[PDB]
Amino acid sequence: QHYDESLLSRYYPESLLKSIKLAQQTIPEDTKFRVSRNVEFAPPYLDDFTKIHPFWDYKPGMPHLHAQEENNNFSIFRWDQVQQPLPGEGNILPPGVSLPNDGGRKSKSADVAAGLHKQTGVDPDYITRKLTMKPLVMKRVSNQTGKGKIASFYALVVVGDKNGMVGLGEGKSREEMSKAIFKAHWDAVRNLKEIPRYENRTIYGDIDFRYHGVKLHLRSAKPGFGLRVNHVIFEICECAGIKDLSGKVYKSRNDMNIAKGTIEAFTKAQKTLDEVALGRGKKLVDVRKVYYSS
Amino acid sequence: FRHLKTLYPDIEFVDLEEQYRLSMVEAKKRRGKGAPKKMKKDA
């Protein structure tokens, strides 16, 4: 289409009007333009080519194959910065990727909380605020292979909220011990269980439990007695919220099997007073508690 | 490269290939493996 100078003079710069006039006097209005399917001369988008883009066009004053300035008339005298910054926002960050501005600020508890929430539906806030994690066993194991000895880091950790909920987790990593602890912490939260506690301080009565080669003898204790038990049992009691306990481990004292045996004993070897009363159809009275009641 | 020290007096260029050779010469002098003094035709 051929347009009158008035219209074309309201959209295009004066410097380009002469070129438009000459083109409208050399190309007949009835020109049937054909599309080339061998050579693509124009870009894949529409452009009047009246403005120089700061990025998609050559930089004015910069030397290059098609620079029209004389060699003594270039205007780039500083070379410490990139001449043509990226267009638009200034970045090419892929959709769904984040610029790594900050590194080393992650909390492994928050990483465990986010992953478990997505995988199991547990509340992240409870994991990151209510739970305490204590490593119990940290050793290196090795497998003999044809290539050679392959070492691995083994971590056994216990987590708990100090209010009845405790869990045991194990983790392995061939790379570093920190990765093994992360997996163990992850596993421990998934294994969280509630343990009955008498007066939220001790166990119900005494427990004689056999876990593989470990013989566990645990006795309930008076208020203010403290934890007088194997060190492995001490850590578990701390996380679980057991304050008063006495006990002795016989036969095997393997730390790993003491920890698992203890967790199992607290669940499979205890019976609440309420559960005993309902099963037998009898009333069970705590004499010490009644003595100080109204 | 030898013409650069007069074309551009302001800039100080370093020839790493030449510099490497000169260090290897000094090293051999320190080990006693230097080059024999060349005989003079006058002799």
Binding site: L7, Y11, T31, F33, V39 | -
Partner: protein, 162 residues
């Protein structure tokens, strides 16, 4: 009213326009050569656009037979195993012909396209000038000179004496 896109900008998005040949007087042959076709074709398209505005009827780019050069490099084994790597170079050729144009306009075409040439493209131009049989004012080798000098030197004159 939307922004008007004039015919000059629109032409860029379509195949280059060609002017009809009226008389058929071939005035120039422009042969372009490159080791790759992509710049060769793009530059050829630009020449057709330059000629159109200059009023030069142009034909082409006619593709001419591609020349293939080959080289075989025997490798270290030469044991009749994968012991001969092959290499090749292809010269791509294009011919653009100009018709019924005055010499001055033809020189403007060559000057402009020379100023805005692409990397790795070569250009040969054959100009054809029709002239009259009789013109006005029209349109010794080094070895021979030395031979005369040598034959005058005494080492040769001393024998030529008759």
């Amino acid at each position: 009213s939307t922004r008007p896109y004039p015919v000059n900008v629109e032409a860029v998005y379509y195949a280059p326009l060609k002017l009809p040949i009226k008389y058929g007087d071939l005035v120039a042959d422009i042969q372009l050569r490159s080791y790759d076709n992509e710049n060769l074709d793009f530059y050829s398209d630009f020449i057709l656009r330059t000629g159109y505005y200059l009023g030069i009827p142009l034909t082409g780019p006619k593709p001419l037979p591609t020349r293939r050069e080959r080289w075989t490099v025997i490798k270290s084994p030469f044991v009749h195993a994968k012991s001969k790597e092959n290499f090749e170079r292809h010269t791509h050729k294009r011919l653009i012909r100009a018709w019924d144009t005055n010499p001055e306009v033809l020189q403007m075409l060559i000057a402009y396209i020379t100023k805005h040439s692409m990397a790795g493209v070569g250009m040969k131009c054959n100009f054809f000038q029709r002239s009259e049989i009789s013109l006005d004012l029209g349109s010794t080798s080094a070895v021979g000179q030395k031979v005369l000098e040598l034959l005058d030197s005494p080492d040769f004159k001393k024998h030529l004496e008759k």
